[PDB]
Structure formats: C-alpha cells, structure tokens
Design an enzyme around this catalytic site. Sequence first.
Site: not given
Ligand code: 2DZ
Ligand code: 2DZ
Lengths: 272, 283
Positions: B44, B37, B41, B190-192, B86, B82-83, B154
Amino acid sequence: AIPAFHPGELNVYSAPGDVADVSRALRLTGRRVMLVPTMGALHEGHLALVRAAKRVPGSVVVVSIFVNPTPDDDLAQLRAEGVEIAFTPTTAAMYPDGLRTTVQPGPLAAELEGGPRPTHFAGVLTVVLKLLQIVRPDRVFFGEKDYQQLVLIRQLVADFNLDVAVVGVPTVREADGLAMSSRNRYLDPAQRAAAVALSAALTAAAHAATAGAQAALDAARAVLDAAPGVAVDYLELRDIGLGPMPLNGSGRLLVAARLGTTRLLDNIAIEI
Amino acid sequence: PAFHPGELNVYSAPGDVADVSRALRLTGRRVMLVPTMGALHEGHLALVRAAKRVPGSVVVVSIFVNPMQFGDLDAYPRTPDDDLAQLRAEGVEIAFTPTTAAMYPDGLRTTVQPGPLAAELEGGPRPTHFAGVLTVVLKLLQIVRPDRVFFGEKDYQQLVLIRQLVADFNLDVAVVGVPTVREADGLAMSSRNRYLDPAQRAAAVALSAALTAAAHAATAGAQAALDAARAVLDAAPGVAVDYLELRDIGLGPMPLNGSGRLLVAARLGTTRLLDNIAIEIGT
Ligand SMILES: COc1ccc2c(c1)cc(C(=O)NS(=O)(=O)c1ccc(C(F)(F)F)cc1[N+](=O)[O-])n2CC(=O)O
Ligand SMILES: COc1ccc2c(c1)cc(C(=O)NS(=O)(=O)c1ccc(C(F)(F)F)cc1[N+](=O)[O-])n2CC(=O)O
Ligand SMILES: COc1ccc2c(c1)cc(C(=O)NS(=O)(=O)c1ccc(C(F)(F)F)cc1[N+](=O)[O-])n2CC(=O)O
Ligand SMILES: COc1ccc2c(c1)cc(C(=O)NS(=O)(=O)c1ccc(C(F)(F)F)cc1[N+](=O)[O-])n2CC(=O)O
C-alpha cells in the site's frame, strides 16, 4: 488541442471524447453545462426541457440524441432554440467494448413499468450514467412524464454519489390534457378520444383528494371506467419517492393503460 | 472543512472530502486516490509513493472495509492506529475514513453489475463479490474525483475489472497498476499473510517460486510453463491449489497469444493466497 467550438452556433459532435473535452473547456470558461438527454424526434416536451435549461444564467445547453440499441429536422429545431451543442454518438461509440459493465437498479425497477419491461430501466440508467460521465453537466433535465424513470435516476445520483443536479420538468400536455408522447400519433380517432381519460382520471383524483386517498383512487377508477377500450395495467397511489403512500402528505398517482396496441402512461402530484 | 497542508487531515464525511478535493483541484493540485480496506502494509505504501511522485499531486488514501463485497466481514483485520500512523510517516495529506452509514445510507439499492469476468476465477464461488467491489470503487471515485487511482497488481482480476468499470462508464480517471511488492523470498505482500503460521509461511514461498519458474520455462511454451508451476506447487507441503490459469492479459474472451498472465490461488490451512505474473510465450 480542444475540438473546435463556436459560441452561439449549433456545434455537433459524435465522438464522446470531443464533447467531453469541449464541456470541460466550457466549464473552465465560466459556463454552467446543462444536459438534456433525448432519443431524437424532438417534440414540444423536449422544447420544454431545453427552455428550462436555457434559462439558467450562464448556461450552455448540450442536447444528446441517442437511441439505446428526422436528424436534419432535430438539428434545425435545436438551432432555432439557440442550443449550442448536440451530442450524436453512434452505438459503437457509446458501446465500443459492447455490453459489459452495467447499472443494476434497485427493486423499484421491478415494479410498475418493470413488470412488462423488466430490463428497461437497467438500460436507461446505464446510458444516463454514461452521458453524465461524458458531459459532466451541472444540471440534467428530464420530463415528469416518465416519473418512475425520473425517480430511478434520482436513486442513481444518490447511490453513486454523483455531483449533478437532477431537474424534473412538468409534463407538457395537449390541449385536452393528454400527456405528450411519441406514441399518441398512432391512436385512431376513437382511441385518441378515449385516451383523455388518463389525464382526466388523474386530475379528478388530485381534486377529490381533499376527501382522502380512497376518494381519490375511486374517482380516478370511475373516470377510467367511463372509457371504452382502455385496458388499465395499474393505477397506484405512492409516496413521491414511489414507496408506500403515507397516511396523509404528498404523493404521486400513476396510471398505465393499453389502447389497442399502444401503451400510455401518466402521473400526477397528489396531496392527501 | 479545514485543510492543513503538509499534515494528515482525516475526513469521515463524504461531503468534506469531496469539497476539499474539488477546492484543491481548482487550485491546480492533481488529486490521487489510493483506495484501501486498511490493514496497510508496504505494498500500500508503494501505491502512496507512486501517487506522491506525480508532480503537484495531493494524495487521498481511503480506508473502508466495504461490507457489500463479503463472519468473513467480521474477520477482516482492522488496525486503524497503525494505518494512520503509517500514512502520517509517508507524508499523506488526506485520509478518507467513511462510516458504513455514510456510504450506504439507503442500504443496497442501485449497484454496479460487472461483466462476465466477475463470475470467473475469484468470482466463481462468490457471485456478488465484484459487484460489491465495483460499486464501492465507483462511489469513492465520484466522491473524491481523482485524476488518477492506484491499485496493486496482486489482485489482478480486480484490477482488470476496475479498468472495465472506468472504460464502460466513461469515467474521467486514469487507472494505475503498481507492481506487487514482495517479501525477500518472493512472497507477495498481503494483509492476509499475518494468518500464516511459521510452517505455512515457509511453504507460501511456493506461489511466487511457481510463477517465476513458469515465466522462465515459457520459452518452451504454455504447457512447459504451466507444468513447471504445477511441479513447484506439488512439491510444497500443505499447499492446496484452487486454480492455476494462464489467460490473455485482459482475462477476457480471447485466447492467449504472445502475452499472458498466469494466476494462482491456493489455500494454506484456512488462508487463501493469490499471486500472478506476466508471462511471454516463446519469449
Ligand atoms: C504494490 O504492492 C502491493 C502488494 C499487495 C497489495 C497491494 C499493493 C494492495 C493490496 C490490497 O489488498 N489493496 S486493497 O486494500 O485495496 C484490497 C483489499 C482487499 C481485497 C479483497 F480481495 F479482499 F477484496 C482486494 C484489494 N485490492 O488490492 O484489489 N495488496 C494485497 C493484499 O494486501 O492482499
Ligand atoms: C486480510 O485478512 C482477511 C480476513 C478475511 C478476509 C480477507 C482477508 C479476505 C476475505 C475475502 O472474503 N476475500 S474475497 O471476498 O476476495 C474472496 C475470498 C474467497 C473466495 C473464494 F473464491 F475462495 F471463494 C473468493 C473471494 N472473492 O474474491 O470473491 N476475507 C473474508 C473471508 O475469507 O471470509
Ligand atoms: C416535459 O414534457 C415532456 C413530456 C413527455 C416527454 C418528455 C418531456 C420527454 C420525453 C422523452 O424524451 N421520452 S424519450 O423516451 O425519448 C427519452 C427516453 C429516455 C431518456 C433517458 F435519458 F432517460 F434515457 C430520455 C428521453 N428523452 O427523450 O428526454 N417524453 C415522452 C416521449 O418522448 O414520448
Ligand atoms: C450465480 O449465483 C448467484 C447467486 C446469488 C446471486 C447472484 C448469483 C446474483 C445475485 C444478485 O445480484 N443479487 S442482488 O441484486 O441482491 C445484489 C447485487 C449487488 C450486490 C453488491 F452489493 F455486491 F453490489 C449485492 C447483491 N445482493 O445479493 O445482496 N445474487 C443474490 C440474490 O439474488 O439475492
């Protein structure tokens, strides 16, 4: 090692991985893989699906036989038509982790046949997706009889970006026009005679349509009204994708009815 | 569409990437997908480097903030400059950057319905989230048709559900889980993380400290593991735990035996952090 495959013979595989490997090998040798999914008890409507598949140049035809949860006979019929692959998995083989991730159709599935059978299309689309991933055909063939089903499959293909061509084959009909169905055998003589009203209603409508949509619907309704013991569930004129019918243009008229305990369906192309 | 090897080729149209991919696969290259998404970092880039190590690979990295899995959506960080920078630095040859209209021309219609796992843990308060995730992942796999697809560990629940998608719909792709890259103190990348102020960033060390404490405590059993982790979480200022669960490794309808995964989610202000670790019981 690729599982054994003898060109020009009927080769039967019950393991999804085996048919998958053979199909992959065949694609790499030239052939264009055609899939005809069935539930067995093969009839002349399936013959039409198989013939349509056979005439593609360089085709190898895979017929699956799978009941979502004679065989001797079915296999000889496939041999007689020159089909080279039958895929005959067990329920266990298709669903080794049981029911878990599934396909959820869009809202069209809740309409029409989805009224009496609200989860039926979920199952259909789940199995069709699986068969498509297992066999990876270039083209997949379905009858037009179950038109809503066909439209939902086209939605599946578009929506999940599948790389297969969906081919709809005109409904095979009995000499009086009754659409072929595994259910027709159950009709008694009075019901079988009444059942011609479905196709007669639709063909009347298709010809009435020069006088517009209302004339088409009223003509089909009049024919159904001439029939005893035909309980019409719906009679609907839609666009070809089963949305609302546009003012003029191409459409489809669909009917379903109950005769005694047996449900029959039919549909036809309509030009307004 | 043009493909210049040894350069970064950016495609938005699904048909363009599909055609380039198919053509590469037919010329012997094996196609690796890293779906993201954006907001990339080092974790990824670990995925990318894993993918790059596969002999004869071509790596496709997808960047798409999928609206179907969410002010949430508007809040997601977008750093496309940036993406792509990288990716070019890592030697990636294909970036796939579709538009929402290209992915969802008909809006929401046919979707993937996950199994019951989707209603637990992260999915309990978000009941469509993992449907949205599996639907987009299915689509990206069909578009790109990779031999292998790479995820971080993660978001372990998401990973398991992706394995279930792959199995359940007979997809012809290998799923590769890559161990979580961490900051020097242990914090999961984490991107967060960018939403942690300095105090919250200090406190955030408690997730990984709790998990490693539990993994070592586990020679004394499941209760000792969980109670060690809880203690570390409880000592951390400003950490509000949403859950801490030890489950079987498939997170499925079976009790913990020898091998488990310990999952944590906790909030630091408005930032929700996840982490997990492998646990061996009695080792
Ligand atoms: C090998 O080491 C790592 C460490 C952390 C990583 C990753 C790899 C990859 C991710 C990551 O977020 N990948 S993702 O952009 O496909 C992604 C984005 C958002 C969500 C969310 F939970 F918000 F839905 C999940 C994923 N994902 O990794 O299942 N992330 C987690 C993160 O950025 O929170
Ligand atoms: C990297 O920076 C960001 C910025 C916003 C983000 C995220 C990350 C990830 C989300 C988001 O909604 N992630 S999620 O859809 O996986 C999520 C968030 C909270 C909950 C909770 F269980 F708390 F309710 C569940 C999920 N989820 O896995 O369905 N969101 C949107 C939000 O928190 O409303
Ligand atoms: C070209 O002419 C025709 C006319 C009628 C047809 C057919 C073809 C095919 C069928 C038919 O197969 N019905 S089926 O219920 O056994 C069936 C059901 C589902 C699926 C599917 F793949 F979509 F899940 C395929 C078939 N099928 O047997 O082609 N039927 C209706 C019947 O089998 O009663
Ligand atoms: C346990 O509490 C809930 C509460 C709401 C739920 C559900 C469960 C399940 C749905 C649901 O599946 N809705 S939906 O079929 O419209 C759907 C399906 C898939 C997706 C997604 F994009 F994520 F894949 C989204 C929706 N939807 O709700 O927009 N929905 C939203 C609804 O029925 O509109």
